[model samples]
Target: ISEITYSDGTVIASISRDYLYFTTLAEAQERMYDYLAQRDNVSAKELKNEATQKFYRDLAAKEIENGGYKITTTIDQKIHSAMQSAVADYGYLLDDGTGRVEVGNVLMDNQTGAILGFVGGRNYQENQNNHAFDTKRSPASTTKPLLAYGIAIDQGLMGSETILSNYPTNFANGNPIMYANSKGTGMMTLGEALNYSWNIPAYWTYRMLRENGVDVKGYMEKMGYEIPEYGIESLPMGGGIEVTVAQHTNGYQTLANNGVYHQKHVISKIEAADGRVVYEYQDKPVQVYSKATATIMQGLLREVLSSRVTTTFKSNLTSLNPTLANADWIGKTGTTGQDENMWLMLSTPRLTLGGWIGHDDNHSLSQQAGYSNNSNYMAHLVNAIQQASPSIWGNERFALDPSVVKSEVLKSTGQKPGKVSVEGKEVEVTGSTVTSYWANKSGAPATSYRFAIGGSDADYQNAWSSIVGS
Candidate 1:
């Protein structure tokens, strides 16, 4: 420190510039503030961070000042406050007068991909770690709606009502996989499988997609996820992938925004202390899935939180805000092995929200049943936000894309019922019917490979031809 004299008679010590040195990338990044502070009127002690905080701080360096630049963030102060309140209340519920588990949340704007608000952890002073933006956790069943079912529909390999075998199945290499109950739910539609969060259907659907030469990782990449293509058979069951909650929220925004992924961000504008605009957020959007595919997937996800036969969510938005009961909402739940992580990702027409409850060291949350319920916490957060600004949300509903249409298929074979001529004779195929969503593609399959079981290669060839022709 060096002495600086005042105009009257007072003298004070000033921090020495030479004392600062680079260490890790983190230090160097933070020290960028010091270098700028030396030249500009900025303070070195004011740097802060999550992905959003990091983004703002890095950009704040562009126009440094002692008072700091006026950072106009996308975060809704009301929403952030409400979310923090919900986090605190939930923390109180989870605590048994001992230590508490960790929790995080992220809310994103569906249309602009802006991060409206988030809860990084239980308490910032006690834990500086931002779990929502910095930590990676297994997605579990959340993988079903994003990677498996959505992609299958996009590729025209399956539809919402397509009958899937929930029975025991093996991978091509003879490795067997079963549901969480260690038994199957028998035959169920694609929508039912998702509502129940079953494992076998996602496995078979992903298998069929792989067999059809679909690019699974490519879809994930467009949504800001990276995974190894090798041994990706378990991709459908949320294996071989881990991601921060921020990234996962934006991925779901792809579906909410009609298949366009607007990169999630917090800062909307940065202004100099002198009132000059320095920076603004410019979104780089990517079309990850087609509109038709997104619409069909949206409908299927809506069923997961609906009054369906096997819906798994324990809480709903209406429980807190009765007005939200009629709103068109969609969501999915994810719980990893031993209940180490509980994830809930939900969306209204205008916003997307993601929440997680778990231990920092990855321990099961089985000690208390309240710790096991994720949606209840999510509901509280949403209720608070809605109370803060009810007019901005819970008003709109999702519409089906133009390219999507309803079709009827046979329950016996997942194919259209009709008569086809073979060997100068018309053979009619008939069975109980069910409705399914067919995307931009023609419609449901005219014949299913399941019907070709116990037949010769020629018989299989005919079935394949019929499906391809459809």
Candidate 2:
């Protein structure tokens, strides 16, 4: 720190030189502040962060003092340009939370975990809270890919044929856990449960893993997820999870990286004015899962993009862009009670993109804009971004090791059923819905999984209230 003074050697104030931050070349990398707070010993909160940096900048800018440097992030220019263009084009009045905001998306490199691009919020100066960084929010059905589908199946607690429910159910304590789609699928195959994002199967999976002593908690922690007090009960149906865009993106990135976690970062270094590196980022990709598990999970997410029967906004958006079908992108969507949170994550070999739309108050997304749901809004933003660049997406494939095995599985939706063609055979569904399963090519398959087989209603809806719970 340098002591400041008036022109005549009169003691004034002390000023510090600016510290320059450098990363993989980012544009409008608003997510850098949180990591900056920790490294510079400044409070992570936005109010204090800007204050601290502004204070130093003022002290150094007038030629009386040497300014401390700032940071350069790895946010991809095209993707960053895409996010801004999308947000503006959408022209939605996003809601404000108690003090935070959302309309954020994050993209990262599968190999390095360096955030390639991110959309934090519309207003960063006034709304300083970052929805994209370390800030945590209820993940809703998005948790399925992480825990239910990712961890549950990895632990052998579930399989393709395993049946899950979309019916109203309760825990031993008599707390009711109902499906968001009230007229839910009575019982479904694991793939059907996941494809529909049914609350029952995942909730049920957590229950069985817990009661049977499946070490599911270990699985959670291993994947860098926190196990809430409710144990198996807290997590199954978005009941026990909180996520930031960074964590959320990286979580799916872990799947793309084959179940390995490379701690994510916006900035890779702190530099001095002379370009000498004073500090370097320290991170290593750690194995959080088995190849088979990660492969299976990716295949599960794949169905979300391809299944004609899967009725989510993900499929709806695909119609808007016919090219998406040729792209082979994998993604998932989610929302908390009353639509407190709605998010989506889409991945290809080139990038893993995650997006969200919600409020600081955790209220209705409808109050904010022309959008119907957070996931839909987020997807629109992502699509706009790609459209703006015209060069950001396509032709990349997310390949699994040993190649995931795709097999046709069956049950009929109704007595008359629907006709469908499999990889080879033409099958008739006469009683229930037929589901697609991607099995572990090497290991024998097991049963279905869920938290819907989970705790009481409060356990699941513990995140928010009200229905319209689509």
Candidate 3:
């Protein structure tokens, strides 16, 4: 049985003869082993014994290769076609000296965690490499939202407006943690740090999360990441572990699914030729983050797409696909050091998708012609996906969760609204304030105000005067 059916119950693919032969032999070996163990009433321990193993292998090899079980997958034909087309359209631009640029992408239903579709590489005909499920690459700054900031918010360690020193910070070992610009934004709110994708703040925040006893590894594993015990100190900045695009997409899907994790899978069910159902997909949802925490993180991520400081993604996507204009979307972009890997993870109301573009040899994307960085490439890829399948990918918007509340905090201090007296008159700080959303249970909007970066105590009244005048 070379049948592979799609969600619509239509045959999606038929395996090649060579593949069928290999799979059939492999399947026969496993089936024979189990069949013998059951018939002879032999324990697995006895069957796996070295003396008996060879006999079992010989018997398995002699077993007849009956037609294998037919598989029904969760893949949607329309979505898969769109993803493959998007990759094909952009594969030319991703070429390095060696070959075409390799791509890995996964699209999933946010609620069910069903894999709708994926693209393994630019040209499957030219390259046999399947990058989406088989490859694991460093996520770069993409790790911040999952390992650092999102965890911090979930644990109630920090709020959106919590001020952190974004200056040149250091880890416990005294190694310098720098931003992409190699300089800090001085004192900045957590919201601003995420919206701007600042590295220093993420590093400090992750360090803080560890100090507060957050189970970083536990959370990551539950979200489908393979985190190594070593090199975890740099996890927040995406230096530690490698991950497949499917795993990365699942991490964000947890947020989109209201803090519950549904393991991503393509196979819906399997049946033998005798009409017996051998397997059926069953969902086991894990509660990774609380509803309030996931809601707050959603608000934070939404700010990324609609950032005031950088309107790049919002402007690009809206212009590229007018259908996306009204949909509420949230996303994050990541580029590994030397631009070796580029990542873009996006989510709408019903679907979550992740895309990665890079060389299989880890070549720098910057060295390639017409490719300066990840900015335009990522935007265009997402736009292409949505445009290809207008109905499947990006038409819906994220609705605000009730547990998250909005408050206006001063940009300079990240504190709640307050009035200061200047020339015997009280004035509310309006221009310096920005609206922030927080989980109602996170205990945000600190009772006391914070001073701006590099300002002296004596400069408080002077700062107020300058603000009023401005």
Candidate 4:
């Protein structure tokens, strides 16, 4: 039945013999399989044995075309409209042939993991492509927060200022990890590794997680994430991967949900012609991350847009419009080599969203300030959500969790502390006498550590310093 509607039952994706027929058919096939299995109280194996899998697929298709069973979705009309407008803004090429900036954007309810809005592509007929749902595009640096940094924290493998190496090194995997333009640093901290998206530290961190059998791949499956059949590798710096749009969106939502994953669902329930409830959505959130770990991860990202009274984020960068950008936002920006693709995964307490802007042919765009200017549009996606639900999405704020332990670490790595300019301003360092606050979780013994910052040692202290202090 073509009853797909918004939260209030608006029929935006109404069934006509033509509207999303292919997509809806796929959805129905699965729904029917589950419905039939439950109705018969049997497993997929027995259900299929009763008939062939193809037979069930056909049965599902037949029932959908005639049965008129209705599916109610979680989409918000206002939000979808805004997203459409934003994508329509790029419906055509710039006409200069710089390249097409195909965008895949999705917004979700953080706590419930329910996707409220989705934009597959401006032209589904032209390419039958749903860019927003495809995750095969490496996700650029987007993989860092999902795998490298995230896994480390759940395993209690990082710190707000854990020392991480940034020196270029070749991995036994036969590939030498390097940051853009050989811009790697020395003695970088884990927090900074994420804040600035440093390749060296991310790679080193992944090696540790992989060895400890942290199983990032397996973890994603438990969260209802769609894993690509055979493309995503253990590329710590965002390469060697793929994900459908839904998978990527779910990944970010997992973080916002404090490492808990609730299966993403659109239909509230399916109803028969007689008004019988055919299927109702049921969810039991899976705790994928410790509350404390998720909180700390959020704090590390906080540095990307931290508030500062004196020093600021990116203040010393000398360029980039978002100098010391501290918005009511916490996000990460990523781009492929040669500016071919870009992604931004942004989140707050109320909502978490991720966007991908790129081309279908996989060609490169003219780098904007060497970025191919792809990352700039990420802001539009964010703005689109806010514009649609100003009070709900825009006015939302992330309250810090109590278990999120934070402390000061040396801002410089010099053996002897010295005065240095940071974030376009000079600050005093009280010397090498450094200390930190560490609160162990699950009853681990308490521990203490020292730190150093950049121009000395930085947990991306530069990432924070670049922004004015909050």
Alpha-carbon local distance difference test for all models: 0.67, 0.57, 0.69, 0.60
Tell me the spans in candidate 1 whose CA falls farther than 4 Å from its real position: 1-68, 94-99, 171-175, 274-278, 308-316, 367-372, 419-427, 449-470
Candidate 4 Cα lDDT to native: 0.60
Order candidates by lDDT, high to low: 3, 1, 4, 2
Model 3 off-target regions past 4 Å? Answer: 15-65, 96-99, 171-175, 308-313, 367-389, 405-410, 416-435, 440-442, 445-470
lDDT per residue for candidate 3 within 1-470, as digits (tens), equals: 44666788887544432222232234435555665556667787897688787777665455323445566777777667766666666666556564456777888999899888777776655766667777889988778888888887777666677676666656668876665557554666777777777777776677677667777888888987877673466778788779999889999899887889998887667666676765567899999987777877777788877773333556756776656646777877777767688777778767888878788888777533222223444556666656666766545556657776667776665666567555667666565666666655645554232343222344445455555675
TM-score of 4: 0.77
lDDT, candidate 1, equals 0.67
Best by TM-score: 3
Give the 10-residue window scoring lowest on summed lDDT in candidate 4. Answer: 309-318
* Backbone clash count, each prediction separately: 3, 42, 1, 48
Stretches of candidate 2 off by over 4 Å are: 1-70, 91-102, 181-185, 230-234, 308-320, 366-376, 388-391, 403-442, 445-470
| Root-mean-square deviation of candidate 2 | 10.9
Which residue pairs in model 1 clash with each other?
41-65, 41-66, 42-65
Angstrom error of the Cα, residue 205, model 4: value is 0.9
Models, CA RMSD each: 9.2, 10.9, 5.5, 7.7
Candidates, ranked, TM-score: 3, 1, 4, 2
